[PDB]
C-alpha cells in the first residue's frame with residue numbers, strides 16, 4: 001500500500017484525526033451540563049468519522065479508478081462519504097451556538113447535502129466537460145451556505161450573550177476561509193484540470209481537513225459559550 005506517494009499524507013491524516021478524537025473524548029468526560037454535552041457529542045463525532053475514512057483511503061479501500069481524458073484516474077471517493085456526514089455536523093455546531101431557527105437549519109443541511117452530492121457526481125463523471133458542470137452547481141450550493149452564515153446568523157449572534165457572539169464570529173471566519181479553499185483544490189487537482197499532482201493535492205486536503213475539524217473543535221470546546229449561563 002506504500003506504492004502510492006500520497007500514502008504519507010493519508011497516514012499523517014489518519015493519526016491526527018485519531019489523536020483529535022481521543023483528546024475530545026477524554027476532555028468530554030464528566031461534563032454534565034446538557035448544553036455542553038451536545039457540543040461535545042457533535043464535535044467528537046466529526047474527527048471520529050474522518051478517522052475511519054482516512055484509514056480506508058490509506059488501506060486502499062476508499063479509492064476507485066475513473067476513466068476520463070483517455071486515462072484511468074485515481075479518485076478517492078471516501079472523502080465524500082466523510083464530508084457527507086461531517087460537514088452537516090460542523091454546521092450544526094454553528095447553528096446551535098446561535099440558537100438558529102429550525103427552518104434555517106434545514107435549509108443549511110439540505111444545501112450542504114446538495115453540495116457534497118453533486119461534488120461526488122462530478123468526481124465520478126466520465127465525460128470530462130460535464131465534471132465542471134457539477135462543480136459549478138456544487139459551488140453555488142456552497143455560496144448559499146456562506147451567505148446564510150453571514151447575513152442570517154451574524155445578525156442574531158449579536159443579540160445574544162457576548163461570549164457566544166465572539167466565539168461564533170471566530171468560528172464563522174475560520175469556516176468561511178477554510179471551506180472556500182476546497183472547491184479551488186478540486187478544480188486544479190486530479191479531479192478537475194489536473195494542474196497539481198495527486199500527492200500535493202492530498203497534502204492540501206489533509207491540512208484543510210485537520211484545521212476545519214480538529215482546529216475548529218479546539219476553539220469551540222475551550223470557550224465558555226458551550227455551557228449554559230448558571231450560578
Ligand SMILES: CCCCCCCC/C=C/CCCCCCCC(=O)OC[C@H](O)CO
Nearest residue numbers: 196197199200201203204205207208211215
Ligand atoms: C500549523 C503549523 C504548520 C504550518 C504548515 C503550513 C504549510 C502548508 C503547505 C503547503 C503546500 C506545499 C506545496 C509544496 C510544493 C512542492 C511541489 C514542487 O515543487 O514540485 C516541483 C516540480 O517537480 C517542478 O515544478
Ligand SMILES: CCCCCCCC/C=C\CCCCCCCC(=O)OC[C@H](O)CO
Nearest residue numbers: 018021022025028037040041044045048051
Ligand atoms: C487510535 C484511536 C483511533 C481513533 C478512535 C477510534 C474511533 C472509532 C471508535 C469509536 C467511537 C467512540 C465514540 C464516538 C462518539 C463520541 C461522542 C461523545 O463523546 O459525546 C460525549 C457526550 O457528552 C456524551 O453524552
Ligand SMILES: CCCCCCCC/C=C\CCCCCCCC(=O)OC[C@H](O)CO
Nearest residue numbers: 045048049052053061063064081082085089
Ligand atoms: C449524526 C449522524 C451520524 C452518522 C454516523 C455515520 C458514520 C458512518 C461512517 C463510516 C463508513 C462509511 C462506509 C460507506 C459504505 C460504502 C460501501 C460501498 O458502497 O462500496 C461500493 C463497492 O463495494 C466498492 O466500490
Ligand SMILES: CCCCCCCC/C=C\CCCCCCCC(=O)OC[C@H](O)CO
Nearest residue numbers: 139143144146147150176180183184187188
Ligand atoms: C456570496 C455571498 C457570501 C460571500 C462570502 C465570501 C467568500 C467568497 C469566496 C469564494 C468562492 C469560491 C471561488 C472559487 C472560484 C475559483 C475559479 C478561478 O478563478 O480559477 C481561475 C483559473 O482557472 C485558475 O488560474
Ligand SMILES: *C/C=C(C)/C=C/C=C(C)/C=C/C1=C(C)CCCC1(C)C
Nearest residue numbers: 086119138139142179182183186212
Ligand atoms: C471536514 C471537511 C470539510 C469541512 C470539507 C469541506 C468540503 C467542501 C466545502 C467541498 C466543496 C466542493 C465544492 C463547493 C465544489 C467542488 C467539490 C467539493 C465537494 C470539493
